[PDB]
Design a protein around this ligand. Structure first.
Ligand SMILES: Nc1ncnc2c1ncn2[C@@H]1O[C@H](COP(=O)(O)OP(=O)(O)OP(=O)(O)O)[C@@H](O)[C@H]1O
Ligand SMILES: Nc1ncnc2c1ncn2[C@@H]1O[C@H](COP(=O)(O)OP(=O)(O)OP(=O)(O)O)[C@@H](O)[C@H]1O
Ligand SMILES: Nc1ncnc2c1ncn2[C@@H]1O[C@H](COP(=O)(O)OP(=O)(O)O)[C@@H](O)[C@H]1O
Ligand SMILES: [Mg+2]
Ligand SMILES: [Mg+2]
Lengths: 50, 527, 487, 170, 140, 364
């Protein structure tokens, strides 16, 4: 019974860490991508077309 | 005439953006700039980004509060430099070279490392003063050995004890083989630096030491360039044929500063938010450690970087990046620090990738014995001792050696080889474990045979402190020191077991027992 | 005739953008900037294009004191590297410039750095074992000549020492040539290897050398650290194809070649992957790995290393490096902490040429039987940790003791590890390496103690060590007798 | 006019060493000799046995390490460390002249116990000391014996019979 | 297919370099739909369609016996069964190193022949009990 | 002289942009808008410049009914708050304004909230144990007069109760002016403390008060919570330097100072580093911590509380707060669930004065 209880705690912690790591990698990727998007200028950059 | 390049477009804390002047003037990369915050004062800076529209992303390093938008920006056209020389020894200094009060030559901050031909392998040692680091984790000169561990585990104290150990020798030997020192405090509190300066002044270790402080109140760019400034001071001592020691306090803080600088300058993040090129940072820093070739003066600088660790994990990005760089590592475990023993080195996880070649002739043989003894003792030590009289010799000698490893301050070479010799050869096997250090104290500071009249040895006594330079040359496994060493240790053990051990075991009163307990802990501390 | 000029747009770290009015050069082209302004010849290599008139390129040297709109010359060719007999016994950078102070490099020809992989028709799979002298490798992982090897493991496991021992044992007897490629390596290891190869006369300057050494170390920028392996491959493929010789290709290590491009991935604008590595990691590694292969002309017996960060095998970089190898040697912290060296896990590692048809039947059978024993050994540490040895059958205790002897026996002292071990190395021949493990497999040596197997070579040395240990044990016994007689 | 010397990297090495030995012999404080060795090494002139012996000579005959005094100076430690730098680091081996200088210092300092170690190390390596210095060593030993300075006074006194952290001095 | 995990890495590279929006483990959302475009083309066709058939044996490499990964969870969600090999059995001489408890074929007996159904029902009723018995017995 | 004027440009939450035609003022400068437009007085400190003729600034009060061209007035100085004996026995806001409904504070001089930290020459670490009366705190993690203290603990573990017991023990028998800075904590606790002190004659309004209260609570926007601790330090530093008197500084808690600065950084557009935290977190926390030091003039024996979301020490905020402290006190939830209180985990705790040189050898 004690071993079971330890196993359920270990399972909850394992799955919690798994989901948190997935979210962390996702937010990292979205952050690097978001920074790259932020590094884009809004200027017209007009040039002659004739 | 000062040449201007633009005006401060914006400012975000420690960083800034420069907009170009009407002129087409170009600025170089990684060079220093100046910002005319006032008619008199100037705010130094450094280039970190150039852009298609001529804007310049700039790191600020001084007088940030005085910076505004629209201030003119001058360009020096030079990389960041700082003063260097022997006149800087005995000083706390800003990484910009500005001295911090208490109560001509210039060196580039970012230089290339010595190439594959301009560095000799490791041959000489750096006596940290701790028996473990000198025996089983031999640190050498030109080596770059990491110090890991969780918060409050002895990371700073090891390096301080190393610096304090070197002083007694440096006062004796010539000024070429003495090892100087630099303590770089990145992101640390100012009070800790004051306490360190007071400690070094008490032990007089400040003549051969300098400090480079970039506190938490200080700008991130200063915390970022501090260790490079320390290595830049070490450049001259390399090239002047001298020796020097680097102690980079928490490099994780040096990386937090780089992350701040990068992300505020709109650099893309990476793993654990770092820009990505944080490995190249520590690479450039630590590859400057070397033992230089005789063509370059036979100089050297050791590096003892310190890295904080969270819950004893070696899986974090920076820790892996640094373990990949550093030769060895000195892992400090909270479970052992909290488990009583101090310094809390974990031999299973701490190693040295130089080995015998770093440590000395006298220490090679002792370390070759101690490694085998500890490899045998690791397999048995998990057993609760049940064969109390049927215990093996290894279980005894390993426990006595672990007792000897307990320290607070450094230890002289002569004051360590003899103590470990008595363990590996079994002379300290009859006395119990708790008295293992009081024995050593008498073995090093209260000569019993000279006291009790048993003086047959011609020379070998532990009062002179100059026998070290004969042990260091000949070795104890020699025709002349071995028998005298045995005919000292055996009488010391006999007089101990007769007079002191017998009196110790006869104690039953709580008062005398506590008096003795405090004495044993004090001997663990001072020795 | 005239070489076109380009003008810098921006400089962000190792990344730089360049304008080209007429037309951009191809990808991977070399671009020089004179030493007049920055003090050194600053070379660059296009990684990708942006516009018809604008392109971006990495730099293999550090960019300091570099102004904007500086002229950038189009060499008309990618990074050319020297090849020939003159490359032997000389250190070389990424660019091919000799950094050792030995002299100029005679070069009748200079090949490029990037090249197409060999076609399937060119490839040739020959099952032929390589006698390393190492015992684990001789039995569980018979290295194949002309093949690909990988020493996976974290930091401080012994893959560098395995590279050094394999060099000492193979390159001496290798009548062909050899190539070492330090990639993100410690510079101190470069000095140690150079002095060893000089003292071993593998690099005989006045005579004739047979070993090239290329080095782009941790101090170097990512653009250099990524293009070292291609430089060494330009050196090696010449000896393979043109000279027709057999080649050794040592690498330390590929993970640095990966993480360098990862350090530039964000500057290039490429979106990172789950672990933070570049999206093109698998393709970038395949374009290199497929060049490392034997052909009808010659055969590269490559030996690689990979850093497994935090001992995480699930990391994509080793995960992708599995497919590109034939002998996936694996090292583990646990076996190293147990005092065993080489710290190989026989269960986690496997070989392609471990087949009955490629090698001897007895060799294959002994290896598979040992691997079958060690799994039960794991299943029995699972039990002994709880119950104790008393609660297992004698047939079970027999295999426990046999596996406990095998694990200690497959340890081996190396000549390179004299500093750490303090004991001279042993070269264990493959035939003896099977007779001894089989004799231990069938109980032929059970009376012999366990620790006699620790850190020795063949079976003869084991019996010598057992006789020794019995002598010192009788010495301790009679000394205890005499101590009781005295007092 | 001698065998060409080489570094560990097989490079050619200079042997013209007399101009630096003269800088050693002209010195007045024996820390300058170390800087002379350094400036010699930077010019690809590694020290030879004659140079180390001249440095030991200048050590022994000089009054102080530097112009100003220094605490913890030991005239013998620098000599013996130069010997370690000779044997282990640089590979050069000492000769009778080197150990003779090392013994002259122990004779002057009166440290009669290290002198016997120097004597034993000489003859263990085949070197034969000068009997003048051995007789001076034994004379200092006899003086320290009869005068009671055979050992320091702080060793020849009773230890605390009662265990106490303050009594033992820790 | 040897193998689809690398096909997924290639799709991820193509997507991220073209700046398609990312997702779990840096994979786009429709990577599942990729394998569904493929594996659903496998089918046992009707007697109106020549009675042809296309079988698929997609390989997917695991890491440390992980099955909660993205590509694995997708292909398991798609496939009409699965085969699960193990290295602990591959080293123990059990080659093929299947794990019968985790290996599943939802096509249980309709695929099997007249001679094979009887034998397979017997072997199932044998192995289901052999597992319970060997799992609880000692090593000795 | 004539006052500079600017115009609002854009608004994102508490963050505002202000175009100044002539030139931009320095960072940390206050900028006031009249109550005629928004309905209440509103001061806004500049934090960064975007370009010339622009400044990004954080609001203290809410931005409700703020428009895109409201005139803004440069005060020409940072947020000045009062100091002295007049600050005693009075509650104050982030702006130094009183809310106790008693009367006008009779200050003589006002000091800015933002200030450079003391120099290394001013610092003087004197090691002296602080007898709290608490049993765990004394033996394992002994406190230090003039040093810093940390009560690191999650939700419902008992760090606020430890602060209250330390008040009842230390502060009343301190002989020095105390300060209590509520940073993102319950408004109920401030009322309870004010009544407990007004009943203990520590805030005797008809006599001498030995206490100061500052309360920027969770109800307030991040612009207040991110600059309230600096106000309390402005109070404490006057007693430290000018009066030359020992003082206490109870922060409950610094984690909401960090949270506030993180929310602010998101409004400012700064790229988050880890767990959605600001890239300048370490710098922002050290500029506050290093002001808390015992110079030669006086001593500040701070008692800081820290919150650990999801009971995670690896959270960057506590992880950075650890290095800036002398005596940690890591509270636990499992120990509290076991009925033990205080829920200290002494294996995680640590101190600096735990050496024989300071404390007696038996105590060590
Ligand atoms: N060898 C030792 N013997 C006794 N005490 C020690 C020893 N080493 C360290 N300590 C004690 O450990 C505590 C912290 O040591 P140190 O300052 O080196 O920690 P740290 O690793 O720098 O902590 P942080 O990471 O928080 O800066 C101090 O109280 C110090 O006295
Ligand atoms: N010494 C104690 N004896 C009994 N109960 C205690 C003790 N210390 C704390 N508690 C209980 O812990 C609970 C919360 O205490 P406290 O208000 O200090 O929480 P906290 O640490 O401030 O956390 P939060 O602020 O997130 O609620 C209360 O129910 C309180 O009674
Ligand atoms: N055969 C061996 N004998 C003794 N120690 C070894 C052996 N192989 C490796 N080691 C250990 O590994 C260390 C060197 O590690 P290294 O091989 O450089 O790590 P990595 O290969 O991960 O770079 C040595 O200093 C030693 O502690
Ligand atoms: Mg520290
Ligand atoms: Mg609370």
């Amino acid at each position: 019974g004690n071993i079971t209880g330890l196993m359920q705690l270990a399972d909850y912690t394992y799955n919690k860490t798994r989901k948190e790591l997935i979210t962390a990698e996702l937010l990292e990727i979205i952050g690097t991508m978001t920074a790259m998007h932020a590094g884009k200028k809004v200027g017209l950059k007009k040039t002659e077309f004739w | 005439a000062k040449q201007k390049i633009g005006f401060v477009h914006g400012i975000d804390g420690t960083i800034a953006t420069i907009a170009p002047a009407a002129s087409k003037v170009t600025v170089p990369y990684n060079t220093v700039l100046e910002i005319a915050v006032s008619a008199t004062n100037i705010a130094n800076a450094l280039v970190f980004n150039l852009e298609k529209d001529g804007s310049i992303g700039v790191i600020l390093l001084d007088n940030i509060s005085e910076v505004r938008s629209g201030q003119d920006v001058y360009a020096t056209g030079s990389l960041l430099k700082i003063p260097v020389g022997f006149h800087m020894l005995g000083k706390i200094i800003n990484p910009l070279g500005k001295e911090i009060p208490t109560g001509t030559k210039l060196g580039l901050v970012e230089e290339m490392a010595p190439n594959i031909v301009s560095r000799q392998p490791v041959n000489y040692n750096l006596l940290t003063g701790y028996k473990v680091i000198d025996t089983l984790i031999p640190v050498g000169r030109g080596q770059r050995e990491l110090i890991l561990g969780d918060r409050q585990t002895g990371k700073t104290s090891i390096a301080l004890s190393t610096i304090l150990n070197q002083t007694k020798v440096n006062n004796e030997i010539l000024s070429k083989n003495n090892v100087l020192s630099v303590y770089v405090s990145i992101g640390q509190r100012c009070s800790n630096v004051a306490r360190i300066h007071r400690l070094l002044t008490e032990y007089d270790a400040m003549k051969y030491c300098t400090i480079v402080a970039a506190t938490a109140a200080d700008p991130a760019g200063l915390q970022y360039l501090a260790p490079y400034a320390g290595t830049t001071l070490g450049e001259e001592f390399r090239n002047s044929g001298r020796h020097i020691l680097l102690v980079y306090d928490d490099l994780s803080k040096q990386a937090v500063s780089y992350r701040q600088i990068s992300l505020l300058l709109r650099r893309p993040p990476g793993r654990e938010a770092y820009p990505g090129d944080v490995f190249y940072l520590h690479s450039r820093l630590l590859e400057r450690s070397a033992m230089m070739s005789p063509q370059k003066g036979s100089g050297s600088l050791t590096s003892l970087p310190i890295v904080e660790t969270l819950s004893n994990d070696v899986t974090a990005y920076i820790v892996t990046n640094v373990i990949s760089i550093t030769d060895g590592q000195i892992y400090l475990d909270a479970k052992l620090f909290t488990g009583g023993q101090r310094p809390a080195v974990n031999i299973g996880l701490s190693v040295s990738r130089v080995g015998s070649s770093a440590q000395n002739k006298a220490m090679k043989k002792v370390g070759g014995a101690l490694k085998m003894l500890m490899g045998e003792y690791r397999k048995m030590a998990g057993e609760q001792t049940s064969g109390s009289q049927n215990v093996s010799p290894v279980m005894i000698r390993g426990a006595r050696c672990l007792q000897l490893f307990n320290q607070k301050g450094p230890s002289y070479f002569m004051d360590a080889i003899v103590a470990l010799y008595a363990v590996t050869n079994g002379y300290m096997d009859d006395v119990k474990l708790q008295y293992s250090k009081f024995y050593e104290f008498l073995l090093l500071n209260k000569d019993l045979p000279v006291l009790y009249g048993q003086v047959n040895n011609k020379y070998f006594y532990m009062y002179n402190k100059n026998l070290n330079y004969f042990i260091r040359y000949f070795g104890l496994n020699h025709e002349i020191l071995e028998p005298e060493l045995k005919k000292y240790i055996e009488i010391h053990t006999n007089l101990f077991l007769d007079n002191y051990q017998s009196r110790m075991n006869e104690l039953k009163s709580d008062e005398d027992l506590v008096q003795l307990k405090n004495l044993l802990y004090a001997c663990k501390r001072t020795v | 005739d005239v070489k076109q000029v380009g003008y810098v747009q921006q400089i962000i770290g190792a990344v730089v953008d360049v304008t080209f009015t007429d037309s951009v050069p191809p990808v991977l082209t070399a671009l020089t900037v004179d030493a007049k302004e920055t003090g050194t010849l600053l070379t660059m290599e296009i990684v990708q294009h942006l516009d018809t008139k604008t392109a971006r390129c990495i730099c293999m040297s550090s960019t300091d004191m570099l102004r904007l709109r500086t002229p950038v010359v189009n060499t008309g060719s990618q990074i050319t590297v020297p090849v020939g007999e003159a490359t032997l016994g000389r250190i070389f950078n990424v660019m091919g410039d000799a950094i050792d102070q030995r002299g100029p490099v005679k070069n009748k020809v200079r090949w490029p750095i990037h090249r197409k992989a060999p076609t399937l028709a060119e490839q040739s799979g020959k099952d032929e074992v390589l006698v390393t002298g190492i015992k684990v490798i001789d039995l569980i992982l018979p290295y194949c000549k002309g093949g690909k090897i990988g020493l996976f493991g974290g930091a401080g496991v012994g893959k560098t020492v395995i590279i050094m021992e394999l060099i000492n044992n193979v390159a001496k007897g290798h009548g062909g040539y050899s190539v070492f490629a330090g990639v993100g390596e410690r510079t101190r290891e470069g000095t140690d290897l150079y002095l060893e190869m000089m003292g071993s006369k593998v690099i005989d300057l006045q005579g004739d050398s047979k070993c090239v050494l290329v080095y782009g170390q941790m101090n170097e920028p990512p653009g250099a650290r990524a293009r070292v392996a291609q430089t060494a491959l330009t050196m090696a493929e010449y000896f393979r194809d043109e000279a027709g010789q057999d080649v050794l290709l040592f690498v330390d290590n590929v993970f640095r070649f990966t993480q360098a491009n990862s350090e530039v991935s964000a500057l290039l604008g490429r979106i990172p992957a789950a672990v933070g590595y570049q999206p093109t990691l698998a393709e970038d590694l395949g374009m290199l790995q497929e060049r490392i292969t034997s052909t009808v002309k010659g055969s590269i017996t490559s030996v690689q290393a990979v850093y497994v960060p935090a001992d995480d095998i699930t990391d994509p970089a080793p995960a992708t490096t599995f497919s590109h190898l034939d002998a996936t040697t694996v090292l583990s912290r646990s076996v190293a902490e147990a005092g065993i060296y080489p710290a190989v896990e026989p269960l986690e590692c496997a070989s392609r040429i471990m087949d009955p048809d490629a090698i001897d039947v007895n060799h294959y059978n002994v290896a598979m039987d040992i691997v079958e024993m060690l799994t039960k050994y794991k299943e029995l540490q699972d039990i002994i940790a709880v119950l104790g040895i008393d609660e297992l059958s004698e047939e079970d205790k027999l295999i426990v003791d046999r596996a406990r002897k095998v694990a200690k026996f497959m340890s081996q002292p190396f000549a390179v590890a004299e500093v750490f071990t303090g004991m001279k190395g042993y070269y264990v021949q493959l035939e003896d390496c099977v007779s001894d493990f089989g004799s231990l497999l069938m109980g032929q040596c059970d009376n012999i103690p366990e620790m006699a197997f620790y850190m020795v070579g063949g079976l003869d040395s084991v019996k010598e060590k057992a006789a020794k240990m019995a002598a010192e044990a009788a010495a301790m016994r009679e000394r205890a007798r005499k101590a009781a007689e005295a007092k | 006019a001698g065998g060409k010397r080489y570094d560990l990297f097989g490079y050619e090495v200079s042997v013209a060493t007399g101009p630096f030995i003269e800088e050693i012999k002209k010195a007045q404080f024996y820390d300058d000799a170390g800087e002379v060795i350094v400036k010699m090494n930077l010019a690809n002139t590694p020290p030879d046995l004659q140079t180390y012996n001249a440095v030991l000579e200048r050590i022994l005959n000089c009054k102080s390490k530097r112009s100003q005094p220094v605490k913890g100076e030991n005239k013998f430690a620098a000599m013996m460390d130069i010997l370690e730098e000779m044997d282990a680091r640089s590979g050069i081996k000492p000769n009778a002249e080197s150990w003779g200088y090392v013994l002259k210092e122990l004779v002057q300092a009166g440290d009669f116990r290290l002198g016997w170690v120097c004597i034993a190390g000489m003859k263990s390596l085949g070197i034969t000391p000068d009997q003048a210095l051995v007789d001076a060593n034994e004379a200092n030993a006899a003086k320290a014996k009869a005068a009671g300075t055979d050992f320091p006074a702080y060793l020849k006194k009773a230890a605390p019979e009662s265990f106490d952290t303050k009594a033992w001095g820790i």
